[PDB]
Structures are given as structure tokens and as C-alpha cells.
Write a protein that binds this ligand. Structure first.
Ligand code: HEM
Lengths: 500, 500, 500, 500
């Protein structure tokens, strides 16, 4: 008996117990007489087309791969439930929050951002923490990160940001000039860059990190009154990080450390959990907040906006087939039930488009039919039909146009969205020069202690040293604007590296 | 009360009876408040991205279409059963034939060959008649036509043949020069061309035509002895044809005549049926047959090879959703259960490759998961995994490699294929100059009467008149080799047309 | 010598003249020794996998088809140029209008709306008239119809509208109940329905119809001042229509009448042309227009908004390969150069999303690389990379993130869009009960004469008679609201039909 | 000045020199005014659909990824030429070998086998070494490995083999039980397993390894006489390997070591080269060879079959865009010009099917149109048309059916394949119990010295220790059959590990 992950096949065999092996078939259910040799013209002659067993198997092997996710390609998944522990029905009418003790099944995927499918788990990166709630009002996807903020505040920069974090288009190598050119030109990134290069840049697996919705969302109650909120889901296992040295070692010894850790925890009954909270901001408070409350590079200070407990997330079930339940899972931030809505955060608005769009490419037009993606606790009834790999009844003979006089599905006025008046011209507004430094200073001065500040600067200088000097200079200038000691410490370390 | 096809929606409404309309949802199951107006900035302002209801619906509409079939694009489908009425277990051990009274569910699709999706039913063309038998040993697809023969006898000519029958690559028009250039250069086509231009070139809907497997197949019994066979399925409603004049009228008044006729027959309880027969030829008889018994341009004369009754096909159920059950159905001639095998017919051998191949393109890698294609009366267990739109459990945690020591599916030696010794070099053998005329003469002289012979020549000349004279001449020369009167009658009619 | 379309292959042969035939190759350029017979084990043995010539050809044949367009599937195309004849640079700074005599190459596709790829040209339907202008500021796609208006004024109804015009989801038949249920429930359709059932519902091929942009667009001049406009392109060959009887006959005798007519006109030097005009409306006039000037069911009366001549469209070149240049052409209304912009027409706004979206599905992510779609008179330089079937250099080693310090492409402030303030809440505003009848009455009373009014009512009643009585009644009620004689004439004809 | 790979962008900038930056455009060539901010309703309002610049860029980003290769996903590429140095025209009429000094352009891709796109270069694995020769008779793809043999000798086992080498289907972890269960059950693997776990299992980058065609091929001369051959391409830089300790370190410090090493070598003018040899075996020698000469687990001993020099491969050009020239390159073993043909090696026969098949999935039906895949030194002329992303002229108006009377391409009898008579039944022949040990013993005893034998056993035991004991036992039994010392050394090391 090794760890449960290592004993996967042995356990499968034992579960089968006395049962005879199934008969090996083709995809069309025809039994296979021999699957160890192909049909040839005599023992040393050529292969025949009529070996359809061979072609059937090989053609399917040839088509096994699908495009990886454009970001967050490397991941781990699990299933469990969300349980309401407190009443927030004064803020939201969403059915997922309807009453204390209400349990909703969930699916979760954890990931890194930049690495491809075959990359190591224990690298410095933000972590994805996506949660799908299968509610009676349809799926709610809260597609969070292990950070409350992000590097940029306008979505039209997101492809550029990702490109700068991935491989050089010619050499196919990671490129420090690209990374730091972009970040030095876009100092809105300082806040998340400070988080990334701190100790929480490398969590000790997925169970020891927090998640955040990051964006401001809108909650709407039964009386049609709205507030703004933030979602926080805090680890009940405690924050725990890997040192740079342990992370580097594990990246070679166990590239799949995060997958293995989660699988073994759940398989041995150590079910990880998170406490789910909201922060709430009224429309009036949004008018007077000193920054843009919809700016993704900003947090809401806890003193002014305390955490309000809502419930807990528990993961208690491993995937049975990774490809089916983790590779093919799709989260769309636009999947929000009545009672939860988007705010004007420009980044969130961009995400409302991007996710269904990429899913139609990565998975296919009918990706919502895939079992893990199905809103299986709701009844889907609409006027959508057809498309490739339509795997359901395609809504049978129901009338396929709306409005109609034949009793087909009808809109539900109670589900109408919340209306707001907005003031201004319709145009492109520059946000590059919003406050880039104030909350970063609070982090550097008040949240980090002295050891942490030192590791932060060493982590930064270790990466920034590989960029050209003109880039190093612009970057240090930005850190100086945060705090003269931040910049000067980094510059000192760079001097040492550049001397070598 | 009109015909059942016209009352489809009224019937759907009535079945619903008292029930309240379903709630209209997004694809993710979220209820929709209003699906008749989009979200705008004031009553005359631009559209917002956060109208995800709009985008969800429009994105799905945008992806509704899949590639049509490369041939046989226009079709009609129905479901029913096959019932064994006689014992042929001495010829075949296939479970579908196991005992008298055994019923197997079937799916059928009827089609024309050359026309696209929006083309008329009542045109001169061969008709497809594809039958899928859902057996306990997996699906058996008998992908037949309403003719026992075909235009060509080598599969490498099939793309050329189809191209010559479709549109000019520049003008996008049907092109008589292409059609008759090809047929005049390939006189193996004379036999099927004679069938096509006879009265049975335009059946009166799908219920009044025969089907044929066309190819020689191989039947293998429980003792491992093999014979060759042909499959014939003869209409119990009787042969009935449309005149050229009625067909032309219907092509404008009702392009969907065949679909409507079949749907209304089944909806009013007039279930069409076919009697299913085989012809049998022993290996010794195959050695002495005066032609190639595996030549698709040849029949087996009934005197020497009588029809042996096997059972009946009955269609008694209409599709509930056409797209799901007819557009997405896939038949592969290579889906043959134990007891039925391919013969060396070169055309059949080519089809063993082509159909799964086109299906992976038209439908997708996992097209066998689509419900209508699923071998739902068999248990599929194998080492195939993953691929796009994997809509099942993907065989869970089962071991995915063979051989293994963990109890996963095993080959079944009884399902091994039948072995034959073949003699000769492995090379390309010319078949262009096999007998092109003998069976055609028997058809023209002995099967057709005098009225039929006249209509045949008028039908040919009506089409051939549009080709250039050099093509008309080569074509007439080929008909003359069949019978001097065949050619001379055609030439007389051409003279009249070319004079005008 | 027949018509040029019929002599396509003969002409190709003659152009080749003395030249020896090319050597037949595989797709990989390897010469083919024999493409008329497959490789077998002796003359009557099975087919070998090592016949790669066979597999190469068959695999490509198997993948020839792409999804047809979801609407406007059946079409004809041609190439030519647009020439400026008058100066409108006071209204628009677009380079296509820059100076008198400036010629821009164009591509055009004509189509019907509802019919599939194999359907007849001479049917009652709106006609598409899409024009792609290859300008120095990129492609401008004016994706027009042969009508200035449309059936609906909100884009979220478009899928329903199209579904009601296509096949019943169960029977796969055209369904008058669906058509008239939808139109009777949505009387905004009365205006376009009146146009459709008039004589111009069936033009005599594509050369004898007008085109219209239909939507209000915005023109912006060099000083940044904006007006609203409509585009009209009026046939220089004159309006000409097919009678219902001639159209019905041609639908059987020549389903490709429109393709053939256009091809033969251009091949014999009868180059069709259109005169290109705008109507202009100032922002002040838009405030005082008695209807919504952005309502697609409304025209701008010519007395108040005269046609201003701009230039001419001439078609003088046939496609060389239909698939490459007509089937794969993609028009996106969102392709607008500086000086032309969208208006708030809700329908236009919906189209800005839908077309690139469907193109990524029908053609592929890199459909703009396809030669006919390429902006070949502009230089494309941006931060987009990769995607399937990347057929170019993928912009070589250029920096792939923006902003950057390495000299890669830069934004051009002069191309900034025009800013407007809008007033109101962000919500769904009902437009179902805008004026549905006033302009329709003007059409019925003042534009049509008495013979035309009679044919209109006969055309309507001929189609509406097949719907159920409750639908006939609601429809007649709507026509009555237009004019008591309109409704009563239709009702009289229906009485006769329903009596039979 | 760092290494050339690190200075990629700086070099690009400098090449541009004085030039003004290009204008940033959309994909349709329209200039972009501002690409740093999206269009919103006022500074804190929602995003508009009419920001088509945003949608265009984001939709393309969303579709950047294509499926990775099902095996050999992680790779490095380069370009150069092949030069003939000796005359082998007595063995082969292929134009690539036509005369001394003849240069043919080549493309090469190097890879590992099992790792995904984001995996480390310096891991134990076979290495791919694929060479595409762009000849005048079309492309020749020699899709080799850095080993002359492989793990299996029947292609129907290849999917199982690959599955056993990849991730557990439930846990998504690499699984030693899977690896060693398969290899212990299939002792034909002993030969390649011995190579893999020797020092050459981890080469020092791609320049310090040999390549081999591995399979027996057939060479055919101008007189139509055939021999069998093997292809060997031996590094001119010398064999050099990484120690297990250095490889492990580099896997964390530089996952892209192989890419970087090759790029920097070529960029600094150190062009790597290989000497290209054949071994030749006559048909008579094939009859008397003591093993199956077409068995992929066997070599031809050099004493009996000496290396015959042919020419040299030189790599002297880096990719300009990795995605376009390396990710999208496709090699098909079936691309063989006249003078080179397949042998009956069952593994090679399987590959003739699998590669074009997977390419149609990974890249698309028209993947041969992609510039790097194009046979750009040959003229492609055939009857293939259409398919998605047809990016060429689609062969214009040429006749699209064969045979034809209009002067379109013609077969070339000189390119006919070589004919052979084969003897036996057409059936599945078992090869599991061919000689699994004799050549492995020669390797262990005569090729490896004593230090090498020790490292071999340590490398094996280090991996095998993680499998269950029953698997360890079966594996050791197989090594014992090779040589009692091989097995006993491994068993000794296992005892130590299992004790811990
Ligand atoms: C070498 C010869 C042939 C080749 C390469 C070939 C290939 C094809 C292909 C690629 C399709 C489209 C399949 C799909 O997308 O689902 C098709 C359909 C069809 N073929 Fe064949 N075919 C050949 C000969 C024949 C023959 C001889 C028959 C009848 C005996 C036949 C009957 C049909 C029918 C009935 C369909 C439509 C099946 C359906 O309803 O989905 N074909 N063929």
C-alpha cells in the first residue's frame, strides 16, 4: 500500500473483485477477436485496409488531443459542495444563498496561469481557483484567483500581458525582457507584482491558499435593491508557502505536486475547506470611495469593509476521469443566476465575452452538453438548436421560434436585470494614470514584516536581473515611487548581479 | 386537421395540454427575464456586452450548421425493426439472424446522391437506402442503394465520378460535358447508366423502391465455414415510379416530397416494409462465375442464385428531431458484427476507409457517442480515450493500455475474422476492360419491354444532347456496343435535338 | 459554341493550347504512376494500406465540405471596382471616397436568405447584396440587401425569425404555421412583408435589383463632424421582375438561373453596374424625425432626404474558382474604415458581433488570411498571433505585446472613433409597439398602383392560406390596421381558398 | 550583449533601424486609434459591443491554441540543406540522390516522446529527429528517432504503449505501474528499454545525438531493381550525454535547454551537421537473415551490413516564427518520392495511415497548404479540391475529374511502384514470441563496458522500484533471460530500494 494516487489501478482491479473482464469492442460495439496483431498478407507481408480494428483504434488515438486552455492550462480538479452557514438574503435573492444549511454541489479547478500542460506545479505564478455551483437557477461560475487583484485594469491589454508572460515568438523561450518591458511600461501592475514576488507567489499546493472573486460584483435582493460585493474564500487549512529552494527542487522531483497533494488529501478523507465571505459596499459608498471601486488593481480595506460570513466550500470527491471532468470543464464568469450580476469593472466586462468564446473553440459549440458543464440541477428550455456534436434530444419537436402560439418556453419577468443610469460620453477613457502606488505602499509597509520585505526584493531582483539595463532602470523607478526603500533594495541587488 | 406533417406544432401543443410553459433559460440554465429586447444605453443608445442573453443565443445560432454529407446530402429518416422470419444460421452466426421471430431495432436514412441539402427529392438519381441494425454484437450498418450495381468498379475513381456529377468548379453549374465526358471515358458505367435512365431512376418516394447491399459480402457460420452473399430488400408496397413530367412538376411544387410522404405514411399508421433476402454463392461457384463475382457493375442472375428469404424491415417511428436523428446519423460499412465480413470487392474495400474518415470530419472524433449512432444494445469497453466533445464517462478510471494485469477488457477469440489465401503480386491491376456490356444487353433486351426501351433512350438523349458532339459520339459508340438498336435510337434522338 | 458558362472546360483546354498536361501529383508533390486502379493482393484480393495515393485522394474528398452559411447559403459572386464620381469629402474622410475618379477593387456576393446550398434561385425571398471594398485603410464590407428595410427591429429576434423561415425541427419541412405565427405576432414585419410579396420579391436575376445598406450609418469628416447616412446602390440595368409563373417554371428548369445569368453577362462583356448614392441626415434632423431614424423597419422619405450621388459599382470579372472566391468569402459589417462608423441601430449593433463570430466557425479562426478576404491593399500589422491554419509568416519575429520598447506597430490617434453622449438607463427597452403601419400605408396607397395591389394580396393569400385559421385571422387583423382594403382583399382570397 | 536567443527582440529592433513603426491595424487592415483602453459609457460605465477593436483582438487571442501533437509534443526546429557526397544511383533513382554536390533544402524538428508542450527537454526519453527534404519530386519525410529500434514491433500496440507512458486516466499522474506493467508483459521492448536506460537516454541537446530511419525501407533504381535499406545520420559534433544529476538540475533551471542550445549554435555560426549513410540488404540476404529483417526491434549488424556514405545534413537557419515553422510543421512517412518505398515492416505500414490522419485533426484538412509543409520545389497538380481554409487558388478552373478529355493533369507511368509476390494467408500473425533477447545480449555484453552496465542497472532500478512487486518480478525475469547478471544486478538494487 503506497499513497492512494499510486494505487489507482490496484484499487480499480480490487473493486472489480470476482467479475470477468468485459469483452473488448470497437467503438461501434463489435467484439474484437485479437487486438495484439494486425492483418497482413502472410507473416512478412503488407497491412490490409480491412483491418478496421486497427484503423478504428488508431484513428481515435490520432484525435485524442484538444487545444489546451490559452491560459491556466495546467490544473487539478475536485468536487464537493457549498453550504450556507449565515443569512445574506437581505443582500441577494440568489437561490444558492436561500437558507441556512442549503447545500449546492460544486466543481473546482485549480491552476497556474502561464505554464503549458506539461509544466511544473511549484513555480511562481498566480493560481486560478474556479468554482462552479450547480444551482436550481442554473450554473454559477465564480472564476477566481488566489489574489484579490490583477496586473492590469483594462481588458484590451490582457492578450499583450499574457503574450509577455509566455514564450518569445521566434525562440520559443521565456523572455525576461518581454516580462519586464511590459510591467515597467504598465505600473498599474505594481500591486499584483508585489503580491506575486512575496511568499504567497508559491503556495504549498492548492489546499493552503485563499481564493477571491477579485472583481466587484453586484448583489440584488428580492425588493430589487442592489449593493456591490467582493467574494473571498479563505483556506481553513491555513496559508502555507513553499520556499524558493523547495519549490525549485519539487519542480524537478514532482512537476505534478499540486495534483498529487489534492488527490491524496481527498482520497484519505482530509477534505479541504474554505470559508466563504463577502464584503459589501453600498452605491453611496461607491460614490465616495477614494479610488475607483471597480478597479481590479485595488482592494477594499477590511477596516472600512469587513468580511461578512456566508458559508463554506468543501472538496470531498476526486475526479473519476481527469479528461472528462477536469480537462473539459468550462467556467464562464457570465454564468450568474438571478441575484448576482456584473459590475462595471472593465476587466469583468471583457471576461463576459471571452470565456464562452474560447470555450466554443477549445471544446466545441455544444460544450455546455458535456456532463461536467451541464446545469443538471436546472431545466434548460430555450430556442437554441443544432450545432456540432449535439448529444442530447435537441429539445425534440418543440417550437423553435419565439414568440410563438404553441406553448413553448416563456420568459420570466422576475429574472430581469437591475437598471442603472450612467453618465458620460461613449468613448475610450484612459485609466493608465489612476493611482498605481498607494495600496502597494500599504502592503509593503504595513502588511509585510522585515524578513518578508527582504525576500520580496530578492525574488524580484532574481528575475529582473535578466532584463536589459534600460528595462531594469524603468522598473526600479516604478518601485521607488512605491517606496524609496523598495526601489533602493532592488537596485542594490541588481548592482551585485550586473557586476558578476 | 391537415396532414400530420402540417399539424406537427399543433400536436405538440395539444400533448402539453394543461401544463404551464417551461421557463426560458440560457444554455447554462439561468432564467431569462426578457428575450424580446436587447440592453442599450437609453432607448436609442448602443448595445452592451453585458447582454449575455443576447450573445449566448446569437453565438449558438452562429454555429448551428455542420458540413453536409459530401454525397447523399438530402435525406429522410425513420426508425423501426428488423424481424427474422427464416433460419439462415447455416450461413451466418451473426446474432441479428440468431432465431426466428428475433427483432432488432433499426434506423434508416433515404437520400439522393448528387444534390445538396436544399435540392429537390423528385430528380433522376440513385437513391441511398442505409440501414443501421442495433444488435447485441454492436451496430451493423448496411449502407445500400436502390440499385444492385454502381457506375464504377474501382474506388480511386469515386471522387472523380462524384466531381463529374456535381458543379463545375468555376461556374458552380451542373455541367453535361463533365457528366458525359466521364461516363463516355468509363464504359463500365453503362450498366448503372441504363438503370438510372429507366423508369426506376425516379421512384415515387422512398416506400416504392427496393434496396440492395450491392456488394458481395461474406457470411461465416459457427463452424467457421464461409460463403459469399448479396443482400436484397424488396419493397412490400410495390415498385412505383414518377413520370418525368410529374417529377419535374413536383420538383417545383414540393422539393421535399419524399420526406413528407414517408413522414405522413408513418404518422397515419401505414408502416412501410421490405422483405429481406440473400443470394448465396459458394467459394467454388465464385471460382467458376463467368465474371468477377466481386465486380460492383455485375449482378448474380436470379436463375443461378435464387433469393433466400431471411426476414422483414418495418418502419414504424418518425424522428422526433430531424437534426439529432437524421442529419447526425452516421453509417459505416465497416461496422459488421461477427458472422458478416467484407469480400474483396475493391469498391467495398475503399468504403471501409472512407466512411469513419468522413464522419470524424462531418460530425467529430466522438461521433459514435451521438445517441443515434451509439451501439446502445451492446456494451462498449476498450482502450480508446478522450478526443473532443467526450460526452460520456470516458470509461472512468479503467486501465487504458492493453495488455494489462488489472482486469480491463479482453479480446474474444471467437470473434476472429475468417482467413483466406490469395494469389498474385501486390500491384495495381487494370479492370477498365472487364466485360462492360453483357449484363447490360440482358437488361435492355430481356428485362425492358418496348415502351420502356423507348423512354430509356429519350431520357438519355434529353441529357446527352447538352454535351459537345465529340462527347455525344463517344457515348453513342458505347451504347452501340451494348446493342446496335440502343445506340441508333439514341443517335436518332440526338440528331433531332442537335438540328434544332 | 454554346453560352460561355457551358463552354467553361472547352475554353480552359484551348487556353492551354499546345502545352503538355501537368504531371499528376499527390498533395505532397510526389508524382503518381497510376490513379485509375488501387493496389490489391493479386487481381481479386483485398486493398493494401500502402496505397497512399488512394488514401491521400480519398481523405481529401472526405473533407471537401464546410458548413454552409447559416443564412444566405445560396449565392453568386463577381469582382469589379467602385469609382468615385462626385465629392462627398465634406461628409466623410474615408479614403475610398477621397477624390473623383478614384477606383477601389470590389468583391460582390448575391444570395437568397432562407434556402440551403442546393435550393432554387428564382424563389420569393429578400436578396443579399454584399460588397467588399478593398481600400488602403483596410476592407470595408457593406453587407446590404435588395430592400432598404427588414422584418424586425431588435437583433435578439433574428434567430427566431430565421428559424420560423426554415424547416420544422421535427418534419424538416417548410412550415406556413411557423412563418405566419411569427409574422402575425410581430407586426413590425408588415413593412418588409409588403415589399416581399410585391413584384420585387422575385427579381429577374441579380443584375435587375437595387441594393441598400438598409441601416443608418455614421459618416465622419476630417474636422471630426458627424452625420447619419443611408447607402443606396441602384441598378443601371433597370428593375425587372419574374412573374410568379415564370419563377415557378425556372425553379424546376434552372435552379441556378441567377448564377448563370451573372456569369454569362460578365463573360460576354455586358458588365452590370449600379449607381451609388447616400442620403444624409444631420444630428438635429435625427432629433426631430417623426420615427426612430435608427429603426430598420423605416425608410427616410426621399422628399425630405434626397439621394446624393457618390459613384458607381461595376462588375467586370467572374470568379476563377467558385469555392475559393465565393463560397469562402466573408463579409463583416464591423469592417469599416475611418470616416464610416456604426449608428445606434440595434440591429446593426447585433451584426457587429454575429458576423466575425460565425466566420470563425464556418471558415476558421484565420479566415481573414484566405486570399479573397485579405485586406491586400492595406498593411496588416498588429499583436495577433497563431491560431489554426496560420498560412502566412505570422508576423515573423516581431514583438507580440503592446506597449513595447522595441519599435513594433503603434496606434494612430487620427483613427479614433467619434464620441457621443447618450441619455438614459442601461436596460431592455421595448420597441415592439413603435409605429408598425404608417410607412406601410404610404407604400400600399402611393407607391403601388391597382394591378400591383391586387398581385400583392394574391401573393400573400397564396402563402397564408396554408396556416391555421387562428393565424390567418391575426395576420388579416394586422393588414387591416395598415389599410381596410389591404386586409379585406386578403380575407376575400382566403375565404375562397379555405372554402375549397 | 547576452546570448543571441536572449537578444532576439533587441536584434529585431536594430534591424528596423530608422524606420517608423508600422500603423497598428485590425485583422481587416483598418487602422486602430487607441488599443490601450476599451469603449465604455462614461469613465465608470459598462463596455459596448461596438468596441470591435477589442472583440477582434480578444476573439483571436481566444483561438490561438491548436491541439498539441499526440506524441513528440515538445520540440525544437531548424532549416538547412542536404548535400549528396557519394553516388548511390545504383540503388535509388530518387532525384534527391541524383548527382554529387546536389543540394536539397531541409526542415528538421527534434523532440521528446511522452512529455507535453510545457515539459522539460533534459529528461530520459527517445528523441525524435524528423527531416523533411523539399525535392523536385515532392517532399520526402524521413521521420526518424535517435535510436535504430523501437519498443514494439506491431502498430496496434502503439496507442497502448503511449498510454502506458503518459498519465494515469484518473489521477493525471505519471504511473510506474503502467509503464512497467506494459513493458514486463511485452518483452520485445527489452532492446529499446536497454538503449533508453543507458547513457544515450539523455543526450546533451539535439546536436550530440544520431538519427535513424529505424525501419527497413526499399530503394528502387532506374532499371526497376529493388534493395532494402536502413538510413543512419550520425552526428558530426560527436555523441555527448548528460549525467542523470546534470539532467535533473537542468530540468528545473532550463526546461528549454535543447531549444536554446540549438538556436544559439546556429545564431553564432556553429552549424551542426550529420553524416548520412545507408545500409543495404538484397532480397536474397533478406531471405537468409537470421531474424525478421523488417522487425523494428532488430538492427542489421554493421559487420554484415556496412554503412555506405551518401551525403550530409547541415542546419544553418533558425525559425523566424516558431508557431508557423515548427509548431505547424507536419511530417508524413508516406511522403516518399519515386526511388524510395515502404518495406513490409508492420510498424512502418501503420505509420503510413496514422500521420496524415492526425495531421488533418491537429492542423486541418488543408495542412499541406501551410508554407512550411508545402512541396514548394515541386508543382502540385491533381483532382483534389476545396476543404476548410483553402488558402490557394484551389487549382482555378481546371477540370476536376479524371480521366477527362480537356488536358488536365496526367499520371506518369515511370512513377509506378515496385511489384512483389507475397506468400501466405491474409490473417493476424503473432509476433510476440519472435527473438526478444539475442541482440539485447550483444548490446549488454559487447557494446557496453562495465561502468556503463552499472549505470544502466541503476537507471532501470531507480524507475522500476516504484512499481508493485509482482511487476518488478516479471520485469526482472525478462532481464534475466537477456543475461543472468543483468537481472541479478537489477534485483540487487531493487532489494535495497524495497527495504528502505
Ligand atoms: C468507393 C465507393 C464509395 C465511396 C468512397 C463512398 C463514400 C461516401 C461518403 C464519403 C459518404 C458520406 C458519408 C457521411 O458523411 O455520412 C457516402 C454516403 C453514402 N454512400 Fe457511399 N461511397 C461509395 C460507394 C457507395 C455505394 C456502392 C453505395 C451503395 C451500395 C453507397 C451508398 C451510400 C449511402 C446510402 C450514403 C448515405 C448514407 C447516409 O444516409 O448517411 N456508396 N459515401
Amino acid at each position: 500500500s503506497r499513497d492512494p494516487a499510486s494505487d489507482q489501478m490496484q484499487h480499480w482491479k480490487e473493486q472489480r473483485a470476482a467479475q470477468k473482464a468485459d469483452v473488448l469492442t470497437t467503438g461501434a460495439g463489435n467484439p474484437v477477436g485479437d487486438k495484439l496483431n494486425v492483418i497482413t498478407v502472410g507473416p512478412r507481408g503488407p497491412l490490409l485496409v480491412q483491418d478496421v480494428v486497427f484503423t478504428d483504434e488508431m484513428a481515435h488515438f490520432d484525435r485524442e488531443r484538444i487545444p489546451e486552455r490559452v491560459v491556466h492550462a495546467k490544473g487539478a480538479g475536485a468536487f464537493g459542495y457549498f453550504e450556507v452557514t449565515h443569512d445574506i438574503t437581505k443582500y441577494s435573492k440568489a437561490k444558492v444563498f436561500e437558507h441556512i444549511g442549503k447545500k449546492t454541489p460544486i466543481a473546482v479547478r485549480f491552476s497556474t496561469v502561464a505554464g503549458e500542460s506539461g509544466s511544473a506545479d511549484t513555480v511562481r505564478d498566480p493560481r486560478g481557483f474556479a468554482v462552479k455551483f450547480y444551482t436550481e437557477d442554473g450554473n454559477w461560475d465564480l472564476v477566481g484567483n488566489n489574489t484579490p487583484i490583477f496586473f492590469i485594469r483594462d481588458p484590451i491589454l490582457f492578450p499583450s500581458f499574457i503574450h509577455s508572460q509566455k514564450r518569445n515568438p521566434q525562440t520559443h523561450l521565456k523572455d525576461p525582457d518581454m516580462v519586464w518591458d511590459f510591467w515597467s511600461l504598465r505600473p498599474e501592475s505594481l500591486h499584483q507584482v508585489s503580491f506575486l514576488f512575496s511568499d504567497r507567489g508559491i503556495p504549498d499546493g492548492h489546499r493552503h491558499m485563499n481564493g477571491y472573486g477579485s472583481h466587484t460584483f453586484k448583489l440584488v435582493n428580492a425588493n430589487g435593491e442592489a449593493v456591490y460585493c467582493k467574494f473571498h474564500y479563505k483556506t481553513d487549512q491555513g496559508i502555507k508557502n513553499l520556499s524558493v529552494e523547495d519549490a525549485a527542487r519539487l519542480s524537478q522531483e514532482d512537476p505534478d505536486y499540486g495534483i498529487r497533494d489534492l488527490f491524496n488529501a481527498i482520497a484519505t478523507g482530509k477534505y479541504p475547506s474554505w470559508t466563504f465571505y463577502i464584503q459589501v459596499m453600498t452605491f453611496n459608498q461607491a460614490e465616495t470611495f477614494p479610488f475607483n471601486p471597480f478597479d481590479l488593481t485595488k482592494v477594499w480595506p477590511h477596516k472600512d469593509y469587513p468580511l461578512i460570513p456566508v458559508g463554506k466550500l468543501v472538496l470531498n470527491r476526486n475526479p473519476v476521469n481527469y479528461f472528462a471532468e477536469v480537462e473539459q470543464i468550462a467556467f464562464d464568469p457570465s454564468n450568474m443566476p438571478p441575484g448576482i450580476e456584473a459590475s462595471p469593472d472593465k476587466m469583468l466586462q471583457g471576461r463576459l465575452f471571452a470565456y464562452p468564446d474560447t470555450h466554443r473553440h477549445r471544446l466545441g459549440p455544444n460544450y455546455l452538453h458535456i456532463p461536467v458543464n451541464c446545469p443538471y440541477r436546472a431545466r434548460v428550455a430555450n430556442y437554441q438548436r443544432d450545432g456540432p456534436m449535439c448529444m442530447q434530444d435537441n429539445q425534440g419537436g418543440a417550437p423553435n421560434y419565439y414568440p410563438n402560439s404553441f406553448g413553448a418556453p416563456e420568459q420570466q419577468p422576475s429574472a430581469l436585470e437591475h437598471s442603472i443610469q450612467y453618465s458620460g460620453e461613449v468613448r475610450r477613457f484612459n485609466t493608465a494614470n489612476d493611482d498605481n502606488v498607494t495600496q502597494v505602499r500599504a502592503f509593503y509597509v504595513n502588511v509585510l514584516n522585515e524578513e518578508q520585505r527582504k525576500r520580496l526584493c530578492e525574488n524580484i531582483a532574481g528575475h529582473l536581473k535578466d532584463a536589459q539595463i534600460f528595462i531594469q532602470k524603468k522598473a526600479v523607478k516604478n518601485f521607488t515611487e512605491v517606496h524609496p526603500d523598495y526601489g533602493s533594495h532592488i537596485q542594490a541587488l541588481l548592482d551585485k548581479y550586473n557586476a558578476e
